[PDB]
Amino acid sequence: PFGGLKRLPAGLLLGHGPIRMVLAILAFLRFTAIKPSLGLINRWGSVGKKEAMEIIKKFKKDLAAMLRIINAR
Amino acid sequence: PFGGLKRLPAGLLLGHGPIRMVLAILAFLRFTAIKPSLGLINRWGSVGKKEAMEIIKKFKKDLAAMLRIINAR
């Protein structure tokens, strides 16, 4: 009925939480052309290049999976 | 400040709202391995293949841009 999340965890949109979820909500804001908060931008600017690259590349493969689901539907 | 979004709009996690934002939050839930609600699943299964392909391909361009920014940092 509600799925795994009733709402975003407190502080996420302000840059607090696990780095993968912070980068995912940053991706969500970019997908929807919404400006992120200052805390979120600070978090984005402070993540190590390596771990962020890994996280975003995995996001890329998640999108690829969604596209395959759409094609196969 | 706190960015253009203090919280997700009402109903979005339950599948209500513009299709781009609904697919963006589905992407977020996939990125973070969180199960979507039945309403979101219904939206996902009901969206036109063409329109969803276009939206998700644009998301792929957004992730490419984020990766570009990380590489530039």
3-state SS of A47-70 is CCHHHHHHHHHHHHHHHHHHHHHH
Phi/psi for A21 (5° steps) reads: -70, -35
SS3 B71: helix
Q: Are A40 and B36 in contact (CB under 8 A)?
A: no
Number of CB atoms found within 10 A of residue B66's CB = 20
Residue B60: count other Cβ atoms within 10 Å of its Cβ: 16
Q: Report how many helices (DSSP H) and strands (DSSP E) chain A contains, helices first.
A: 3, 0
Q: What token pair was written down for A16?
A: 């607090």
**What does DSSP assign to residue A8?**
P
Q: Say yes or no for a CB contact (<8 Å) between A73 and B35.
A: no
Q: Are the beta carbons of B13 and B41 closer than 8 angstroms?
A: no
Experimental method: X-ray
- The CA dihedral of A66, A67, A70, A72, to the nearest 10 degrees, is -110
**Phi, psi values for residue B2, rounded to 5°:** -100, 20
In order of start, what are the domains of chain B with their CATH numbers?
Answer: 1-73 (1.10.10.930)
3 state DSSP class of A37: coil
Q: Which chain A residue has its CA at the smallest distance from B44's CA? A: A70
CA distance B19 to A17: 27
Contact status, residue B13 vs residue B45, Cβ threshold 8 Å? no
Exposed / middle / buried, residue A60 (Cβ in 10 Å: 0-12, 13-18, 19+): middle
For chain B, give the number of residues: 73
B 10-69: CB under 8 A from A? 13-14, 20-21, 23-32, 34-38, 40, 45, 49, 52-53, 56-60, 62-67
- Residues of B within 8 A of A59 (CB-CB) are 27, 31, 63
Residue owning tokens 């993540």: A47
Helices of type H across B13-48: 19-31, 38-46
